[PDB]
Design a protein around this motif. Structure first.
Motif, PDB file in Angstrom:
ATOM      1  N   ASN B  10      20.360 -20.147  12.752  1.00 10.48           N
ATOM      2  CA  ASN B  10      20.934 -18.833  12.466  1.00 10.48           C
ATOM      3  C   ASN B  10      20.600 -17.866  13.592  1.00 10.48           C
ATOM      4  OD1 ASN B  10      18.210 -18.919  10.688  1.00 10.48           O
ATOM      5  ND2 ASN B  10      18.583 -16.804  11.222  1.00 10.48           N
ATOM      6  N   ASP B  11      21.496 -16.919  13.850  1.00 10.32           N
ATOM      7  CA  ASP B  11      21.284 -15.878  14.852  1.00 10.32           C
ATOM      8  C   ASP B  11      20.904 -16.424  16.232  1.00 10.32           C
ATOM      9  OD1 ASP B  11      20.429 -14.872  11.923  1.00 10.32           O
ATOM     10  OD2 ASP B  11      21.314 -13.187  13.011  1.00 10.32           O
ATOM     11  N   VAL B  12      21.602 -17.477  16.665  1.00 10.89           N
ATOM     12  CA  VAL B  12      21.358 -18.159  17.926  1.00 10.89           C
ATOM     13  C   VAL B  12      21.686 -17.231  19.098  1.00 10.89           C
ATOM     14  CG1 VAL B  12      22.189 -20.092  19.385  1.00 10.89           C
ATOM     15  CG2 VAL B  12      21.405 -20.527  17.030  1.00 10.89           C
ATOM     16  N   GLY B  59      25.502 -18.140  10.891  1.00 11.00           N
ATOM     17  CA  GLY B  59      26.141 -17.046  11.591  1.00 11.00           C
ATOM     18  C   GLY B  59      25.385 -16.478  12.765  1.00 11.00           C
ATOM     19  N   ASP B  60      26.058 -15.559  13.436  1.00  9.95           N
ATOM     20  CA  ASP B  60      25.605 -14.826  14.610  1.00  9.95           C
ATOM     21  C   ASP B  60      25.304 -15.747  15.794  1.00  9.95           C
ATOM     22  OD1 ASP B  60      25.992 -12.243  13.546  1.00  9.95           O
ATOM     23  OD2 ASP B  60      23.852 -11.718  13.533  1.00  9.95           O
ATOM     24  N   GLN B  61      26.250 -16.660  16.086  1.00  4.28           N
ATOM     25  CA  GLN B  61      26.230 -17.488  17.298  1.00  4.28           C
ATOM     26  C   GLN B  61      26.689 -16.543  18.434  1.00  4.28           C
ATOM     27  OE1 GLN B  61      25.950 -20.858  18.554  1.00  4.28           O
ATOM     28  NE2 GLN B  61      24.842 -21.536  16.748  1.00  4.28           N
ATOM     29  N   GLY B 194      25.179 -18.391   4.257  1.00  5.92           N
ATOM     30  CA  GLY B 194      25.746 -17.136   4.706  1.00  5.92           C
ATOM     31  C   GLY B 194      24.876 -16.193   5.517  1.00  5.92           C
ATOM     32  N   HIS B 195      25.483 -15.072   5.870  1.00 11.79           N
ATOM     33  CA  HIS B 195      24.941 -14.121   6.808  1.00 11.79           C
ATOM     34  C   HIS B 195      24.831 -12.698   6.271  1.00 11.79           C
ATOM     35  CE1 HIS B 195      23.739 -13.479  10.864  1.00 11.79           C
ATOM     36  NE2 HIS B 195      24.235 -12.269  10.713  1.00 11.79           N
ATOM     37  N   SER B 196      23.840 -12.442   5.399  1.00 16.93           N
ATOM     38  CA  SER B 196      23.624 -11.106   4.824  1.00 16.93           C
ATOM     39  C   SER B 196      22.173 -10.613   4.784  1.00 16.93           C
ATOM     40  CB  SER B 196      24.224 -11.053   3.426  1.00 16.93           C
ATOM     41  OG  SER B 196      25.595 -11.412   3.481  1.00 16.93           O
ATOM     42  N   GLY B 217      20.683 -16.036   7.111  1.00 22.25           N
ATOM     43  CA  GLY B 217      20.478 -15.484   8.444  1.00 22.25           C
ATOM     44  C   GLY B 217      20.458 -13.975   8.370  1.00 22.25           C
ATOM     45  N   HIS B 218      20.777 -13.347   9.496  1.00 24.06           N
ATOM     46  CA  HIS B 218      20.971 -11.927   9.687  1.00 24.06           C
ATOM     47  C   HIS B 218      19.665 -11.099   9.833  1.00 24.06           C
ATOM     48  CE1 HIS B 218      23.214  -8.309   9.897  1.00 24.06           C
ATOM     49  NE2 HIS B 218      22.717  -7.822   8.766  1.00 24.06           N
ATOM     50  N   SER B 219      18.595 -11.383   9.072  1.00 24.01           N
ATOM     51  CA  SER B 219      17.331 -10.669   9.167  1.00 24.01           C
ATOM     52  C   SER B 219      16.290 -11.334  10.105  1.00 24.01           C
ATOM     53  CB  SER B 219      16.758 -10.447   7.769  1.00 24.01           C
ATOM     54  OG  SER B 219      16.791 -11.628   7.003  1.00 24.01           O
TER      55      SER B 219
HETATM   56 ZN   LIG Z   1      23.942 -10.450  11.674  1.00 25.16          ZN
END
Ligand SMILES: [Zn+2]
Ligand SMILES: O=P(O)(O)CP(=O)(O)OC[C@H]1O[C@@H](n2cnc3c(NCc4ccccc4)ncnc32)[C@H](O)[C@@H]1O
Ligand SMILES: O=P(O)(O)CP(=O)(O)OC[C@H]1O[C@@H](n2cnc3c(NCc4ccccc4)ncnc32)[C@H](O)[C@@H]1O
Ligand SMILES: [Ca+2]
Ligand SMILES: [Ca+2]
Ligand SMILES: [Zn+2]
Ligand SMILES: [Zn+2]
Ligand SMILES: [Zn+2]
Lengths: 519, 519
Positions: B10-12, B59-61, B194-196, B217-219
């Motif tokens: 996540n967040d790569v 998410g956040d590739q 997911g991404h929240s 992800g996301h945090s």
């Molecule tokens: Zn994000």
């Protein structure tokens, strides 16, 4: 009943031209002050009115603007001769270019006696310098004679470069036998004219028997009776009265600095040379007094040679660069921060991080209203001594002692107050001298992200500072004695010039590097 | 008894190549980490060992290095396809180049399902985007099937540029009917991907009936069981257990960011898809795991196009430029001061004096050990969003509210923590949110010598800040609502590049611009 009018200047420091109110370059001519052409007009006006006048200088004509950097004293002789000075006493900056820089430009070319009674010359110099300066001069004034005895700071060896061949004796010890000699020659009216500071001036007035008046310099003392005409705040009444040990009321006068004011004292003497009374005040040489067209025209002729130091714009400032003594010897001044920021930026071009700079070494402000322009001329008045910014290695204990020294006699406008870079110092003046540093944080070097940590007494720090400080100047004996490494650095003005050119637009601020606490 | 191994990233954020420990450019290869060639080697090694494996991305590739600035998502598709990802959920940065920047590079080229159940498309876009992303995918895994339901931050409209044609519904409300649909199709094993953020992830685990596992992800949440392998401090155990409202123990996982770790969770399911147990830990992708030679060789082929952004040395740093979130979202960081100093220096080239910058906008540190070199590449990872540094006029009350906002929910690594220039702010965190600013001094403008004076609520100030903040980003609604004047400025990276070139050698320090008091 015989009245004498004494006109006096001191610490003019190469302000040949009129200057701004703060003694920096004249930009707005309609509000400029001082200069030798304006001084000529008032001196003329007084000579017309008064039959018995003496125009005296109490030293430190040498050093201050591009005029001296280029003419090296030749301008002092020429314009003092044109103003028809009656006598001048030697100041400490008269020896900045050695004894040969005093002899050839000024001594061999002055048409007035240059005086110092406490300067004795020995060795090979004794023969050269004989008669070029005198301990006193007996001056005819109308149908009378007035004796003038000179004196120069006992500590000129530590302040300038008089050399090993000149001996500076205690002022009082050297003056007394010359004053006695004048009395035996029936010179009953005696002026002590010299360059040692208001505190010594007061002592001479008290202790030297037979001195009627003391005209001093060196401390840039502003004295005034009544409401003052400009920003200078009076240190006392003009004249300052000292009651001598033998019971006489002795007036003591000084006239600030930079040729901004003309000292003016009227003395009412009786037939035996006793001072019945005196009164006066320094005359502010503002825009209302016109510049003499003949001196002005001659100043403009000599100004052509200096214009090559004003054509190249080094950079630009959008802030007033406060290099005033009122700021820089009392608190954090942005001129100090600029200079320390240039010192530090130059040394990296390795890393050292810390900077200390004596406030007294900042010899002038720079104005931002001239479309913010900065020239070599502007910078030469801030840093006139041709010093270097040297690297030094110091123990934290050494640095703590220097910051204690910075404020040991705070409140007297002494030049030892340090401007800093990479140091956050907090002083508490309610504390006893030698114990006023309540916080001293320094920018770490053995760290990847620099940050401020308390100074440690047992640690070692690399500090960029003027060679004046590395050599123990301004009483910083602890730096010279205790330093672990000293490396000679780059010329002070070239360092600041280089930095201002790299930055293009400067805006140094007062930002909390030096603070005072009174909780 | 059926065991599933979930591998997750996540967040790569475009860390296609291996990086230094802090996620900045790899200099010393022997101690570098992450990258897609190294990730391939561990994923391979696990696929060899375990028969039931899913490789997921939360998410956040998109957005983070020169790779994305140049390939704009084409690299994400290619290297995710080469790693053979089973599924990816849409993150907020997948919409940074609009919906067409998502569609053409990634969606139309991925060989794996890209998922979001709470994204509904309307208007003309509804026809274009249909089928390019899915709400869920039922994936065969051995002799079984696993359902994966996607979700993307409800607040993506405020964080990116998804456009007016996409609707972001509440995650829980949108997920529940898709999870119910999967159950009616007898899909008994369900992963919510997911991404929240971890906080929403925990809520989904609690509230969405039928979700067996949550992969988020996301945090940038780092979870771990036992002694951690690197500098990241765990926010909880891995997996984090949530007891759902219907009484099930639901594991929640996240794997920090930047491809530094590979998430690894083993789930023991019974024949009805109940989670009997789970265990695992994020695998640190350090130097010990070799980079796969085939992916490495292919990375090196794609690296040629990017080398023109690495040849020109902009300047040099002699200090570590701390752009880490651990610093920049918690205290004064020297990367913040550098960026604010460049912002202010550029605006003068008139004068404004103050700067505020969201800590979250500083997306990477820069290392000084590479002989201190700074390139466009180094800077593109710090400032990847292609924003501008805008001039704004604000009331002091507005600025007080922004500084209260800076620390309203302090301690959560949120990007609203402000880095400053020309401001001295003191916070007291023992105070209640909305009342933690105990001192706020600002650099005067209506003054010839700039100095720090307390901010006045009734006064107006000129502030340089990112357009992200001027538009009310990071919840700074008060800036956008209350500002008196807004002028569009210069591109963020060009401003910092220009400043670093003018300075030649930089050494920004942490100097007391932001302080905390706990007397
Ligand atoms: Zn994000
Ligand atoms: O100096 P004034 O007599 O005018 C008395 P003031 O009160 O206006 O200023 C005193 C302050 O000026 C400073 N100062 C003075 N001469 C300094 C110097 N070099 C001199 C010099 C040495 C040898 C060879 C040539 C040149 N270098 C640096 N700071 C100096 C010092 O800080 C001191 O406290
Ligand atoms: O952002 P992540 O999802 O990775 C979650 P994180 O915790 O690592 O970082 C969150 C922080 O990043 C910052 N951030 C995020 N996107 C930002 C932006 N532009 C984006 C954008 C808008 C529209 C069109 C294109 C581009 N500009 C400035 N700061 C931003 C912000 O400070 C926020 O709090
Ligand atoms: Ca007498
Ligand atoms: Ca299940
Ligand atoms: Zn002087
Ligand atoms: Zn002097
Ligand atoms: Zn992210």
């Amino acid at each position: 009943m015989w009245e004498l009018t004494i006109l006096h200047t001191n610490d003019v420091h190469s302000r040949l031209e009129q200057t701004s109110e703060d003694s920096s370059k004249c930009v707005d001519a309609s509000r400029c002050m001082g200069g030798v052409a304006r001084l000529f007009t008032k001196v003329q006006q007084i000579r017309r009115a008064e039959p018995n006048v003496l125009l005296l200088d109490a030293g430190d004509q040498y050093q201050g603007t591009i005029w001296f950097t280029v003419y090296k004293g030749a301008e002092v002789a020429h314009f003092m001769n044109a103003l028809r000075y009656d006598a001048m006493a030697l100041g400490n900056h008269e020896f900045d270019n050695g004894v040969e820089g005093l002899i050839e430009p000024l001594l061999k070319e002055a048409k007035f006696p240059i005086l110092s009674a406490n300067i004795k010359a020995k060795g090979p110099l004794a023969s050269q310098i004989s008669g070029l300066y005198l301990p006193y001069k007996v001056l005819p004034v109308g149908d009378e004679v007035v004796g003038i005895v000179g004196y120069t700071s006992k500590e000129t060896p530590f302040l300038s470069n008089p050399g090993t061949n000149l001996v500076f004796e205690d002022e009082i010890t050297a003056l007394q036998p010359e004053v006695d000699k004048l009395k035996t020659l029936n010179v009953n009216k005696i002026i002590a004219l010299g360059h040692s500071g208001f505190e010594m001036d007061k002592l001479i007035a008290q202790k030297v028997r037979g001195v009627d008046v003391v005209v001093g310099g060196h401390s840039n003392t502003f004295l005034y009776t009544g409401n003052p005409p400009s920003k200078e705040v009076p240190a006392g009444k003009y004249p300052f009265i000292v009651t001598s040990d033998d019971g006489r009321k002795v007036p003591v006068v000084q006239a600030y600095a930079f040729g901004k004011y003309l000292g003016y004292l009227k003395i009412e003497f009786d037939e035996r040379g006793n001072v019945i009374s005196s009164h006066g005040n320094p005359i502010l040489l503002d825009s209302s007094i016109p510049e003499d067209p003949s001196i002005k025209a001659d100043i403009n002729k000599w100004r052509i040679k200096l214009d090559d130091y004003s054509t190249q714009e080094l950079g630009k400032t959008i802030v007033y660069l406060d290099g005033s003594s009122q700021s820089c010897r009392f608190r954090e001044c942005n001129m100090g921060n600029l200079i320390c920021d240039a010192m530090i930026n130059n040394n990296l071009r390795n890393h050292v991080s810390m900077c200390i700079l004596n406030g007294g070494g900042i010899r002038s402000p720079i104005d931002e209203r001239n479309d913010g322009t900065i020239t070599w001329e502007n910078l030469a008045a801030v840093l006139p001594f041709g010093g270097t910014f040297d690297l030094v290695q110091l123990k934290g204990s050494t640095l703590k002692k220097a910051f204690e020294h910075s404020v040991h006699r705070y409140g007297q406008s002494t030049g030892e107050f340090l401007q800093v870079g990479g140091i956050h110092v907090v002083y508490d003046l309610s504390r006893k001298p030698g114990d006023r540093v309540v916080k001293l944080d320094v920018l770490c070097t053995k760290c990847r992200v620099p940050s401020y940590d308390p100074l440690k007494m047992d640690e070692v720090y690399k500090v960029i500072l003027p060679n004046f400080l590395a050599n123990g100047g301004d009483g910083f004996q602890m730096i010279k004695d205790e330093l672990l490494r000293h490396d000679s650095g780059d010329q002070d003005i070239n360092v600041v010039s280089t930095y201002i050119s790299k930055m293009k637009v400067i805006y140094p601020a007062v930002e909390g590097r030096i603070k005072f606490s009174l909780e």
